[PDB]
């Protein structure tokens, strides 16, 4: 089970909110909130954001209190399917959008992370997890790397 927010998660909520409280008053307006949710992966159409604001507002201002943000984002975070993150990551490896992570892709990632890996090391990293044998890593293969079963 996972009924509660872990520490990284509570931290993510705080940081995201902090980024957009521009007058530093523990409240976000509609425009600030729109991007705060985008940051967390929770993009909503204009009217749904507004409907959300109206739902947690006692005194008529298009503002959202941090304490409320924390609750709403909190339940959205708990419902997060960890697989979405894996698949999103796959896109980021696959620069050129071929549906596969090739050695040139992986070399770019390594270099970007500042790692120093010889092409043999990179070739061997693919080889061990390349199941169909085409010398590259497809989406399902990547998911298998980032899993336990």
């Amino acid at each position: 089970l996972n009924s509660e927010l872990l520490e990284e998660q509570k931290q993510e909520i705080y940081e995201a909110f902090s980024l957009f409280d521009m007058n530093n008053d523990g409240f976000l307006d509609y425009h600030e909130l729109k991007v705060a949710m985008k940051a967390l992966g929770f993009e909503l159409p204009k009217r749904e954001i507004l409907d959300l604001i109206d739902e947690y507002d006692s005194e008529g201002r298009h503002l959202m209190k941090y304490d409320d943000f924390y609750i709403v984002m909190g339940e959205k975070i708990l419902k997060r399917d960890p697989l979405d993150e894996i698949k999103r990551a796959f896109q980021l490896f696959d620069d050129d959008h071929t549906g596969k992570i090739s050695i040139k892709n992986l070399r770019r990632v390594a270099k970007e992370l500042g790692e120093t890996l010889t092409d043999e090391e990179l070739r061997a990293m693919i080889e061990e997890f390349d199941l169909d044998g085409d010398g590259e890593i497809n989406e399902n293969e990547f998911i298998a790397i980032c899993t336990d079963s």
Binding site: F20, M22, E85, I86, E112, L113, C146
Partner: protein, 73 residues
Amino acid sequence: GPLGSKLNDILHVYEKSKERELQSQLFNAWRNRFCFYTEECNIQAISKRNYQLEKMVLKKFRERLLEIVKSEE
């Protein structure tokens, strides 16, 4: 301005650093399982092989020692 609203720029910088930490994390996981199977487990596998092969040979020694003792009376 030329990179959007101040608000929208803040967002960009944030998403980029996140994308980077995602690539870093999962690259590291990839590399870890790679070393698990090709280094850690390989050494275990070679050890089990070599150990059993040695066992096999010492069982042979024992048997022959008997045969030598049995070789006189």
